[PDB]
Amino acid sequence: MAQNLKDLAGRLPAGPRGMGTALKLLLGAGAVAYGVRESVFTVEGGHRAI
Incomplete structure (x- = not known):
């Protein structure tokens, strides 16, 4: 039969x-x-960044 x-x-x-x-x-x-995170950096107390 046709199916x-x-x-x-x-x-x-x-x-x-x-x-x-x-x-x-x-x-x-x-x-x-990721890009935004890379743009920010933290310097902790007692430290100084050049």
């Missing part, structure tokens, strides 16, 4: 989405945080 067979034809151009966006966003946030 159900799915038939997909043609391809739509594009890339997979969703996971990539999340990862990129996370990376950007981490980079920004």
Whole structure:
């Protein structure tokens, strides 16, 4: 008896989405945080910086 067979034809151009966006966003946030931290330094008491 005839059965159900799915038939997909043609391809739509594009890339997979969703996971990539999340990862990129996370990376950007981490980079920004890292940059800010690098910009700041602390000199503790009794010390002096040149």
